[PDB]
Design a protein around this ligand. Structure first.
Ligand SMILES: CCCCC/C=C/C/C=C/C/C=C\C/C=C\CCCC(=O)O[C@H](COC(=O)CCCCCCCCCCCCCCCCC)COP(=O)(O)O[C@@H]1[C@H](O)[C@H](O)[C@@H](OP(=O)(O)O)[C@H](OP(=O)(O)O)[C@H]1O
Ligand SMILES: CCCCC/C=C/C/C=C/C/C=C\C/C=C\CCCC(=O)O[C@H](COC(=O)CCCCCCCCCCCCCCCCC)COP(=O)(O)O[C@@H]1[C@H](O)[C@H](O)[C@@H](OP(=O)(O)O)[C@H](OP(=O)(O)O)[C@H]1O
Ligand SMILES: CCCCC/C=C/C/C=C/C/C=C\C/C=C\CCCC(=O)O[C@H](COC(=O)CCCCCCCCCCCCCCCCC)COP(=O)(O)O[C@@H]1[C@H](O)[C@H](O)[C@@H](OP(=O)(O)O)[C@H](OP(=O)(O)O)[C@H]1O
Ligand SMILES: CCCCCCCCCCO[C@@H]1O[C@H](CO)[C@@H](O[C@H]2O[C@H](CO)[C@@H](O)[C@H](O)[C@H]2O)[C@H](O)[C@H]1O
Ligand SMILES: [Ca+2]
Lengths: 233, 232, 232
């Protein structure tokens, strides 16, 4: 059975994010930006589009904004990648202005959400990885920094969310999407510890493709266990 | 016929026109005035009991756009405190608005006409700012037009964000930011303007001297501000 | 002649004095105790149930001045996490203050004598911070003296800003940042000792021994801290 696994991992590693995983992410995030505008969503979206778009972009690339800040790199940075900004703006356009509010309505249907919900955990596992990597690039010896920046990209979307609100002058602790994503932060810490530990090389043995597999496996295990344990109540 | 002519003259002298030291004293003046007004009934006893804290905030607001521009571009937010000239001039105005004899400087700025010129002057400077924002940005990311747009807009409208973080840090909240509700259009003005300049620099499809456009946009920043001064 | 030598010898030894680890275990010690208290009644449950959050909240407060300093200067704010020996030591004090057996380390720090001892050392530690802030600012921009001062003051008495933003992100507003009234003399003392050291390095307007002047401030920060315990 092993073979097939190392084939799973070797492929996983090669798996690109653009554009399906991205659009899954951008989709879930912006649908939330909308959902949180409370009843005001409809009116605000129509009279303050830029202000609305900006809030959506902050949440789509929140992990980057956060890492950059942590790393002394220019926060504006995420706006160089025209590819991503475009795609997200499109997804942004649809969630707020799609005809017959279709796209919004389709994502909200149970089976679909779940696909997305999973796809996203793959994109997260990916971010946790690229964080620890970039971290170890600039600071190969400082493991803590690697683990933080990793956990930063894996779960720091909440912080950017809080900051955006405090600036819009609105407090909204519905910060409980699922009361479960709290698993996200701990998961991202261990997930990052490992990759951080593995890159140093000093103490663990097994192929990256195989370990990264198990962590993406877990992320998906839980984000499902959050979807499936919510539904029974 | 005659209208096309007159366009070039203003630009030349406009572009030659240094904001310093009069536009800076206009701007500083208004900003530090506002810092004093939002200080409410307290303002009076605060300025005297905590001159430094009073100063910093005033400093923060005079150069707010700078502090933001830097942060966004990774640059040291401390940098504005380097230009010793700007800080000295500003601090003077600061000193006046809060401690002028018979609080004269403050009042003279209050009258409908004066306060209206200080404001029209501030509009040119703001444009001056959106210009420098787009340029410095384009200089670093010659082809990341969004970034340039954002930074220019930040440069021309970002005072609000700094204002907010300062209050948060001081544990106080006043959503009454929009003294006028044009400033939500002001930012929009800055956004369209900034992205106009971002286009010029790209060098794609555009015919008009640089001295011609800076003046055309000023007409709009002044027009929106004037449309805000006439009504109420 | 007879006693002119006793004071000159103290400046050389203070210069020889390391901060690690007896001063740090004081500073980290105090800082982390405050983190604990502020969690209020829930402090107990929260520390057991959310050890990580609690830890990061601590580290933020132990190295606050660094974070603020880095941020200001344009440097990577995550930087102070590279110093393993510190995070290591600081984490121990953290472990102790929160989960010590019979909670001894915490109690010991509570007695008026010990809290007093620690209080002073930390003050030496501050002196230290103010210094390097002025230094490192001067290293990069030795002519911009304001920056050297803000950065010195930030470094010296800026943990309050970090505390504020930490609460804002935690969704709590415990504005009673006011433990003692001294942390109000703390920021000003830091502002002076900053401008004094920023002057020294300029050397342009006065000559004085580096070990005497540094020794005087260290005593002055301790003076104000003593006045808090001996006067009230
Ligand atoms: C002067 C400058 C001074 C410079 C100081 C910088 C020093 C640097 C330190 C590096 C720290 C990086 C660690 C990142 C860990 C982290 O994730 O932060 C925690 C702790 O935050 C608190 O609640 C607050 C608890 C206190 C501790 C953390 C906050 C400190 C952060 C620094 C930001 C400073 C502000 C700038 C938040 O994580 P969480 O569990 O509270 O929030 C979750 C989490 O983010 C989930 O991943 C997320 O779900 P997904 O969208 O599916 O990913 C949910 O997001 P939503 O709001 O959209 O539903 C959130 O509900
Ligand atoms: C951790 C690392 C994470 C950090 C990474 C983030 C990197 C992001 C890059 C994008 C930055 C683009 C900024 C350009 C837009 C901008 O400036 O914002 C606009 C609208 O949007 C909002 O923020 C209003 C609220 C709507 C939602 C947007 C929130 C943006 C938040 C991000 C804050 C990032 C900074 C931290 C604010 O403009 P406004 O209409 O809200 O406020 C007015 C307006 O600025 C007026 O021009 C101004 O009067 P003037 O003196 O005549 O200029 C008023 O100020 P005063 O009361 O002192 O007179 C303001 O009160
Ligand atoms: C786009 C970005 C926007 C760009 C903004 C760049 C601005 C640049 C230059 C500013 C540089 C000046 C920094 C030096 C000031 C400084 O040190 O802060 C002062 C004044 O605070 C303000 O009014 C704070 C005034 C607000 C401005 C600075 C904040 C920048 C950081 C956060 C972002 C927010 C932006 C605003 C604090 O004032 P304090 O007397 O209340 O604080 C004390 C003091 O720190 C004591 O040492 C300490 O007691 P100890 O235990 O003995 O050490 C107490 O801390 P704890 O109770 O937690 O132990 C504090 O309670
Ligand atoms: C070397 C690796 C170490 C780096 C790891 C990064 C640190 C992890 C931070 C996540 O910790 C979070 O802290 C929050 C505090 O803001 C908790 O809020 C929770 O608990 C609070 C009370 O303490 C409630 O007010 C909130 O509603 C509730 O969500 C949240 O659950 C917890 O996940
Ligand atoms: Ca509140």
């Amino acid at each position: 059975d092993q073979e097939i696994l190392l084939d799973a991992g070797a492929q996983l590693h090669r798996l690109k994010m653009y554009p399906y995983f991205d659009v899954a992410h951008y989709l879930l995030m912006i649908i939330e930006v909308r959902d949180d505008l409370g009843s005001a969503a409809s009116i605000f979206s129509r009279k303050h589009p830029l202000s609305c778009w900006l809030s959506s972009m902050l949440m789509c690339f929140a992990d980057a904004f956060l890492a950059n800040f942590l790393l002394g790199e220019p926060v504006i940075a995420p706006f160089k990648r025209h590819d991503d900004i475009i795609l997200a703006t499109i997804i942004w356009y649809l969630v707020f202005y799609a005809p017959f509010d279709g796209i919004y309505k389709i994502a909200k249907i149970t089976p679909v959400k779940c696909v997305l919900a999973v796809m996203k955990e793959v994109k997260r596992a990916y971010k946790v990885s690229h964080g620890v990597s970039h971290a170890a690039k600039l600071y190969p010896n400082s493991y803590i920094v690697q683990v933080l920046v990793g956990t930063a990209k894996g779960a720091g979307s909440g912080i950017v969310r809080t900051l955006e609100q405090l600036v819009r002058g609105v407090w909204l602790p519905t910060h409980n999407e699922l009361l479960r994503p709290s698993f996200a932060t701990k998961a991202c810490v261990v997930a990052a510890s490992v990759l951080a530990l593995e890159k140093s090389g000093t103490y663990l043995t097994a192929p990256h493709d195989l370990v990264y597999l198990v962590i993406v496996g877990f992320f998906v295990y839980f984000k499902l266990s959050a979807v499936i344990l919510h539904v029974t109540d």
